[PDB]
Scaffold this motif. Structure first.
Motif, PDB file in Angstrom:
ATOM      1  N   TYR A 176       0.626  -1.433   0.213  1.00 49.42           N
ATOM      2  CA  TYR A 176      -0.667   0.085  -0.082  1.00 49.42           C
ATOM      3  C   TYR A 176       0.870   1.566  -0.261  1.00 49.42           C
ATOM      4  O   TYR A 176       2.531   1.180   0.570  1.00 49.42           O
ATOM      5  CB  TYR A 176      -1.223  -0.353   1.360  1.00 49.42           C
ATOM      6  N   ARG A 177       0.132   2.444  -0.235  1.00 51.43           N
ATOM      7  CA  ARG A 177       1.074   3.320  -0.578  1.00 51.43           C
ATOM      8  C   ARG A 177       1.543   3.996   1.225  1.00 51.43           C
ATOM      9  O   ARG A 177       2.672   4.433   0.968  1.00 51.43           O
ATOM     10  CB  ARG A 177       0.639   4.306  -1.423  1.00 51.43           C
ATOM     11  N   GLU A 178       0.154   4.028   1.729  1.00 50.66           N
ATOM     12  CA  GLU A 178       0.939   4.221   2.984  1.00 50.66           C
ATOM     13  C   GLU A 178       1.308   3.049   4.113  1.00 50.66           C
ATOM     14  O   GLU A 178       1.540   3.457   5.079  1.00 50.66           O
ATOM     15  CB  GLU A 178      -0.933   5.249   3.584  1.00 50.66           C
ATOM     16  N   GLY A 179       1.945   2.327   3.613  1.00 47.37           N
ATOM     17  CA  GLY A 179       1.953   0.877   4.107  1.00 47.37           C
ATOM     18  C   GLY A 179       1.018   0.430   4.479  1.00 47.37           C
ATOM     19  O   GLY A 179      -0.059   0.707   4.598  1.00 47.37           O
ATOM     20  N   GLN A 214       6.529  -0.262   5.039  1.00 46.08           N
ATOM     21  CA  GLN A 214       6.606   1.038   5.235  1.00 46.08           C
ATOM     22  C   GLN A 214       5.934   1.761   4.045  1.00 46.08           C
ATOM     23  O   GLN A 214       5.515   1.114   3.149  1.00 46.08           O
ATOM     24  CB  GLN A 214       8.254   1.307   5.213  1.00 46.08           C
ATOM     25  N   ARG A 215       5.647   3.053   4.509  1.00 45.44           N
ATOM     26  CA  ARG A 215       5.624   4.034   3.460  1.00 45.44           C
ATOM     27  C   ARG A 215       6.051   3.785   1.934  1.00 45.44           C
ATOM     28  O   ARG A 215       7.424   3.680   2.150  1.00 45.44           O
ATOM     29  CB  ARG A 215       4.701   5.590   3.411  1.00 45.44           C
ATOM     30  N   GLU A 216       5.265   3.441   1.253  1.00 44.08           N
ATOM     31  CA  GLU A 216       6.284   3.594  -0.303  1.00 44.08           C
ATOM     32  C   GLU A 216       7.959   2.808  -0.073  1.00 44.08           C
ATOM     33  O   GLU A 216       8.257   3.265  -0.798  1.00 44.08           O
ATOM     34  CB  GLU A 216       6.314   4.847  -0.754  1.00 44.08           C
TER      35      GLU A 216
END
Ligand SMILES: COC(=O)Nc1ccc(-c2cnn([C@H](CC3CC3)c3ccc(-c4c(-n5cnnn5)ccc(Cl)c4F)c[n+]3[O-])c2)cc1
Length: 236
Positions: A176-179, A214-216
């Motif tokens: 996910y983009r936001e982790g 983690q994000r990204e």
């Protein structure tokens, strides 16, 4: 598995837990049943493994605490590591375990199909990562098999997140983009399973990532479709 939830008995019958017995018995990696004598897993899992003598494959397990000294398991006859494997982040993270005997398929232990010939351009929208791994970077192995739904991301986006690595067509990324949901320590070797037309396919092998969820920073998986020829040659 980060951000996951508990599985129920019979839910992921192709998932196995690979134990080492040296110097003590413990879960080492996930794996997937792909034939009556064949487990597909990650080559990185065998870094410290002196030989197949110390491996045990357990199927039909929901909780690790089910495994006692009388719990039956399959011995490993052979570990077949892809001859180009060097480290997880540079790819070829794929291994076959040939079991010493054949699995009798039951509700609790079943094979997952490889990505099908002619599905090379399918867009998988229903993919799940499963395992007994950490719930966070500094955690512990989980007693109950966890599951999380994670979306695939394009290799182009994945490469932009991992500019220090070579993301190749033999890899597939998911996150996910936001982790918040991802594999983690103890999940590698297990499946990224995607359901298409109500049939499950082994699309990925859990391999590596920068941190956990983690994000990204998508998780990185061995792209099983690119190894079908190699699998078929080894298993046939
Ligand atoms: C008491 O402890 C026990 O008895 N059991 C116990 C068993 C195994 C381990 C342990 C530690 N690392 N690993 C593997 C690599 C090792 C060769 C096996 C590993 C590497 C990377 C990932 C990973 C990550 N992560 C990034 N940072 N962490 N995760 C992110 C995304 C994606 Cl997609 C990933 F795949 C997952 N795993 O599993 C297994 C620890 C304790």
């Amino acid at each position: 598995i980060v951000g996951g939830t508990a599985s129920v008995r019979g839910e992921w019958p192709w998932q196995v837990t690979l134990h080492t017995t040296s110097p003590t018995q413990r879960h080492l990696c996930g794996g997937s049943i792909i034939g009556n004598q064949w487990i597909l897993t990650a080559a990185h899992c065998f870094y410290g493994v002196e030989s197949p003598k110390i491996l045990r494959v357990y199927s039909g397990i929901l909780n690790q605490s089910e495994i006692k000294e009388d719990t039956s398991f399959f011995g490993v006859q052979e570990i077949i590591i892809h001859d180009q494997y060097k480290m997880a982040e540079s790819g070829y993270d794929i291994a076959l375990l040939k079991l010493e005997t054949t699995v009798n398929y039951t509700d609790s232990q079943r094979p997952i199909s490889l990505p099908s010939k002619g599905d090379r351009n399918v867009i998988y929208t229903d993919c799940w990562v499963t395992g007994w791994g950490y719930r966070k970077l500094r955690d512990k192995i989980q007693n109950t098999l966890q599951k999380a739904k994670i979306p695939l991301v394009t290799n182009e986006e994945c490469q932009k997140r991992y500019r220090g690595h070579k993301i190749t067509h033999k890899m597939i990324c998911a996150g996910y983009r936001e982790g918040g949901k991802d594999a983690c320590k103890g999940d590698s070797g297990g499946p990224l399973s995607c359901k298409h037309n109500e049939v499950w396919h082994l699309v990925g092998i859990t391999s590596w990532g920068e941190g956990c969820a983690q994000r990204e920073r998508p998780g990185v998986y061995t792209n099983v479709v690119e190894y079908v020829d190699w699998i078929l040659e080894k298993t046939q």
